[PDB]
Design an enzyme around this catalytic site. Structure first.
Site, PDB file in Angstrom:
ATOM      1  N   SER A 256       0.853  -1.171   0.000  1.00 39.37           N
ATOM      2  CA  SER A 256       0.000   0.000   0.000  1.00 39.37           C
ATOM      3  C   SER A 256       0.902   1.237   0.000  1.00 39.37           C
ATOM      4  O   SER A 256       1.672   1.442  -0.939  1.00 39.37           O
ATOM      5  CB  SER A 256      -0.949  -0.017   1.200  1.00 39.37           C
ATOM      6  OG  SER A 256      -1.525   1.260   1.429  1.00 39.37           O
TER       7      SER A 256
ATOM      8  N   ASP B   5      -3.715   5.030  -5.670  1.00 44.97           N
ATOM      9  CA  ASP B   5      -2.660   4.501  -4.820  1.00 44.97           C
ATOM     10  C   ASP B   5      -1.878   3.438  -5.601  1.00 44.97           C
ATOM     11  O   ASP B   5      -2.153   3.168  -6.780  1.00 44.97           O
ATOM     12  CB  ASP B   5      -3.226   3.981  -3.487  1.00 44.97           C
ATOM     13  CG  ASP B   5      -4.184   2.783  -3.634  1.00 44.97           C
ATOM     14  OD1 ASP B   5      -4.588   2.437  -4.760  1.00 44.97           O
ATOM     15  OD2 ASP B   5      -4.535   2.179  -2.589  1.00 44.97           O
TER      16      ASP B   5
ATOM     17  N   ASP C 288      -1.469   0.095  -5.466  1.00 48.27           N
ATOM     18  CA  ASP C 288      -2.159  -1.098  -5.927  1.00 48.27           C
ATOM     19  C   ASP C 288      -3.506  -0.761  -6.547  1.00 48.27           C
ATOM     20  O   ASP C 288      -4.333  -1.653  -6.758  1.00 48.27           O
ATOM     21  CB  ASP C 288      -2.287  -2.111  -4.784  1.00 48.27           C
ATOM     22  CG  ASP C 288      -3.071  -1.583  -3.591  1.00 48.27           C
ATOM     23  OD1 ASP C 288      -3.497  -0.399  -3.563  1.00 48.27           O
ATOM     24  OD2 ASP C 288      -3.263  -2.382  -2.655  1.00 48.27           O
TER      25      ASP C 288
ATOM     26  N   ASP D 281      -6.419   0.058  -5.908  1.00 47.95           N
ATOM     27  CA  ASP D 281      -7.790  -0.174  -5.457  1.00 47.95           C
ATOM     28  C   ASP D 281      -8.444   1.086  -4.908  1.00 47.95           C
ATOM     29  O   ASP D 281      -9.617   1.036  -4.523  1.00 47.95           O
ATOM     30  CB  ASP D 281      -7.853  -1.296  -4.407  1.00 47.95           C
ATOM     31  CG  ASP D 281      -6.891  -1.095  -3.253  1.00 47.95           C
ATOM     32  OD1 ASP D 281      -6.215  -0.046  -3.178  1.00 47.95           O
ATOM     33  OD2 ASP D 281      -6.819  -2.006  -2.411  1.00 47.95           O
TER      34      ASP D 281
HETATM   35 MG   LIG Z   1      -4.650   0.358  -1.949  1.00 50.04          MG
END
Ligand SMILES: [Mg+2]
Ligand SMILES: O=P(O)(O)C[C@H]1O[C@H](CO)[C@@H](O)[C@H](O)[C@@H]1F
Length: 449
Positions: A98, A238, A240, A242
């Site tokens: 993250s 961000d 990743d 999501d």
């Molecule tokens: Mg994320």
């Protein structure tokens, strides 16, 4: 340490190598195979340098435990969710740090249909098995297959919009050197938009900083790209991806609260009468927009595991949290950083309205403080000091998620976080920016008292 620190409430999160390492990862692979129903396990990873080695170690443990592994490679967290559900896998792990520092990494784990694995739903059981596992590493008895093909995933993303109604909008896209630009580039041949790519290339060294569009310095790189290129709006993710973040044509970052009501209007135009799940931190705007669009709003505790299970139990078509998480029934009830901006680009195209105008009256009608965090010496005593002060006004109280207090023309929610030892405040009013400020400051002085 009495328990492994890296096992948090919703995921695994730790500094490498003392909190998370290849040996722990292999043990997590072994323990995960004991927790799942039968079938193979999907593995993917983000752009962090040490993430592939953590994935391999997870694969070795899974395969030593007789689990076929499906390596979907460098990907977004949502692609592990999608491929877990689409391939009908027993489960999946995303290796993702993250936006923790450079020496940190982590994992998000799901079982069948990408249902989350959390502390009380198997993650601490895994932690305990990992804590006591002194067995010698076994040797692999199952195979690894590499499935790089994203066709089903990309086809699924595009099915949310009517591509013939899309206009050639100019969109800034800011992957922050995370992974989102690789999906953007694969979508682009099927879309008419003109993309202005910023911090586009994956780079786990993060020359422009760790992906976090909330930090004002990172926020401004998207805003500047939008204003300087006259873009219709901008999107940043961000690492990743999501989580997605929207900037209107003035460069103004749009507070995530208003995207829930906006996306719910978008979705409910195609899925009439549907239910929409939302969190209790900020509510009034979402409840009104959902109801105005024919939908049924369904209040749920914040947290991706609560939202998802509430969405399943209600057959909700869409769930939205103010903190940049958007979940879609059709998407394994999972969150996506890609569906949201496809739906917004479709909305701007069809309506002829700017993103700014789509939210402007809502933001005037329900101004909010934004989420404000407090690290205090005594969270319980601070909460009590706030409630004691307001008790004479007899607010309507709800305890779905911490404390919600509705005073008529203003309300607040005050929670302890499940991922951080903090108090989190959210305030909103009915069209009153003055009341919002005096109440927010009033509560802040109480918390800091
Ligand atoms: Mg994320
Ligand atoms: O610190 P909080 O508020 O306890 C948890 C955070 O992370 C969760 C899962 O990613 C989110 O669903 C949630 O809305 C929030 F951003």
């Amino acid at each position: 340490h009495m328990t492994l620190p890296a096992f948090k409430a919703y995921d695994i999160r730790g500094r490498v190598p003392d909190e998370l390492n290849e040996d722990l990862a292999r043990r997590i692979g072994v323990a995960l195979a004991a927790q799942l129903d039968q079938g193979p396990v999907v593995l993917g990873h983000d752009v962090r340098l040490a993430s592939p080695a953590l994935q391999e170690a997870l694969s070795a443990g899974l395969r030593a435990s007789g689990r076929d592994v499906i390596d979907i490679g460098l990907c977004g967290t949502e692609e592990v969710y999608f491929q877990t559900d689409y391939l009908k896998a027993a489960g999946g792990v995303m290796v993702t740090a993250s936006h923790n520092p450079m020496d940190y990494n982590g994992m998000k784990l799901v079982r069948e249909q990408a249902r989350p694995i959390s502390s009380d739903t198997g993650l601490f059981a895994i932690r305990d098995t990992v804590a006591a596992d002194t067995a010698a590493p076994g040797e692999p008895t199952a195979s690894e297959q590499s499935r790089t093909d994203k066709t089903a995933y990309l086809e699924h993303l595009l099915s949310y919009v009517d591509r013939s109604t899309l206009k050639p909008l100019k969109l800034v896209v800011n992957a922050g050197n995370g992974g989102a630009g690789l999906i953007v580039d694969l979508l682009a041949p099927h879309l008419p938009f003109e993309f202005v790519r910023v911090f586009h290339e994956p780079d786990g060294n993060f020359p422009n900083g760790i992906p976090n569009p909330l930090l004002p310095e990172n926020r401004d790189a998207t805003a500047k790209a939008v204003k300087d290129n006259g873009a219709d709006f901008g999107i940043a993710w961000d690492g990743d991806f999501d989580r997605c973040f929207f900037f209107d044509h003035t460069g103004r970052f749009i507070e995530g609260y208003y995207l829930v009501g906006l996306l719910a209007q978008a979705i409910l135009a195609k899925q009439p009468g549907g239910k929409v799940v939302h969190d209790p931190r900020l509510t009034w705007n979402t409840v009104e927009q959902v109801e105005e669009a024919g939908g049924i709003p369904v209040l749920c505790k914040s947290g991706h595991a609560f939202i998802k299970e509430k969405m399943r139990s209600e057959n909700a078509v869409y769930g939205g949290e103010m903190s940049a998480h958007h979940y879609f029934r059709e998407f394994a009830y999972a969150d996506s950083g890609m569906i949201p901006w496809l739906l917004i680009a479709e909305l701007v195209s069809q309506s002829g309205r700017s993103l700014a105008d789509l939210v402007e009256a809502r933001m005037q009608k329900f101004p909010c403080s934004g989420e404000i965090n407090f690290k205090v010496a005594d969270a319980k005593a601070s909460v009590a000091r706030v409630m004691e002060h307001y008790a004479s006004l007899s607010p309507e109280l709800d305890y779905t998620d911490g404390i919600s207090a509705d005073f008529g023309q203003w309300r607040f929610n005050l929670r302890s976080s499940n991922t951080e030892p903090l108090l989190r405040l959210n305030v909103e009013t009915r069209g009153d920016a003055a009341l919002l400020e005096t109440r927010t400051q009033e509560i802040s002085n109480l918390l800091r008292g």
